Amino acid sequence: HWGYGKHNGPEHWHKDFPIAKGERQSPVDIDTHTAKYDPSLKPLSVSYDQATSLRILNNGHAFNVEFDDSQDKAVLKGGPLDGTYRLIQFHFHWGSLDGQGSEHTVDKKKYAAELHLVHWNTKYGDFGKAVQQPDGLAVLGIFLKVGSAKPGLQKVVDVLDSIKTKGKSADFTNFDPRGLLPESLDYWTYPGSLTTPPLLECVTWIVLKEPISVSSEQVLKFRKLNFNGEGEPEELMVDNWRPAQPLKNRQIKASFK
Numbered sequence: 446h447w448g449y450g451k452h453n454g455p456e457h458w459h460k461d462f463p464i465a466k467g468e469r470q471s472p473v474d475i476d477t478h479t480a481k482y483d484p485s486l487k488p489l490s491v492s493y494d495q496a497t498s499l500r501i502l503n504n505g506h507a508f509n510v511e512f513d514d515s516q517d518k519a520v521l522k523g524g525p526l527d528g529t530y531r532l533i534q535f536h537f538h539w540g541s542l543d544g545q546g547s548e549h550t551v552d553k554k555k556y557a558a559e560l561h562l563v564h565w566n567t568k569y570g571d572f573g574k575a576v577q578q579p580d581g582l583a584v585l586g587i588f589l590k591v592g593s594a595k596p597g598l599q600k601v602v603d604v605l606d607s608i609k610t611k612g613k614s615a616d617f618t619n620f621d622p623r624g625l626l627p628e629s630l631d632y633w634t635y636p637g638s639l640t641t642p643p644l645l646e647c648v649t650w651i652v653l654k655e656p657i658s659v660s661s662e663q664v665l666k667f668r669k670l671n672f673n674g675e676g677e678p679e680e681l682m683v684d685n686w687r688p689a690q691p692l693k694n695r696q697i698k699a700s701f702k
């Protein structure tokens with residue numbers, strides 16, 4: 446029953462998911478002047494050359510591009526992470542207007558959208574077990590701003606017509622997520638949570654400093670998706686972001702000076 450509307454949105458989630466008011470909730474505002482450089486943080490290792498995308502799904506909250514995570518084919522390692530984390534899916538959060546849409550903010554600045562590449566720690570065997578652990582997931586967050594087109598995003602944009610409504614999926618093979626990355630892998634990192642129910646506190650967040658640029662046409666196509674199912678009254682899938690939550694007893698660390 447949860448969603449992003451007036452009557453079921455982020456301010457309501459705590460009633461079904463009390464952890465919404467927990468000690469390590471996400472997203473957060475990244476105060477760039479207060480984040481501390483940690484010279485011991487290793488470079489990120491993003492190894493996506495053998496990635497196998499399978500399917501794209503409108504789940505009624507966003508759309509997920511899903512990967513074969515039954516082998517170490519696309520993995521994230523290094524940075525703040527111990528061990529190997531396997532890519533299971535990516536998705537986005539976006540706004541109704543270019544001035545909002547991201548979940549994380551940077552010195553209170555909101556971006557037009559935010560990409561989340563979701564990975565789970567292989568020491569826990571599968572995603573369902575991983576989300577029950579404090580170090581179960583690593584989500585790589587990348588901001589989107591509107592300007593020039595991102596060529597590597599276009600194959601995603603062009604399949605969206607086929608998954609307009611909740612519960613629709615389409616084959617989506619041979620998609621290379623490397624085409625969604627910015628040049629720099631400089632990042633901030635902190636311990637947090639899933640930003641949708643069940644809001645589990647299982648995520649090491651790694652948020653890249655450098656945004657990617659996407660075109661106005663590309664983000665306009667995100668905004669044509671529907672939260673509703675086929676045959677139901679049309680509700681545009683926009684503003685599917687949770688606002689910044691209290692940092693509480695956490696320090697955001699930076700990989701860069």
Ligand SMILES: COC(=O)CNc1nc(Cl)nc(Nc2ccc(S(N)(=O)=O)cc2)n1
Nearest residue numbers: 509533534561563572584638639640641642
């Ligand atoms: C209906 O139940 C489910 O879908 C549970 N299975 C499942 N599978 C994936 Cl790939 N992600 C998720 N949840 C999920 C993953 C990532 C995030 S986010 N926005 O913190 O990156 C928020 C929610 N659940």
Ligand SMILES: [Zn+2]
Nearest residue numbers: 536538561640
């Ligand atoms: Zn997300």
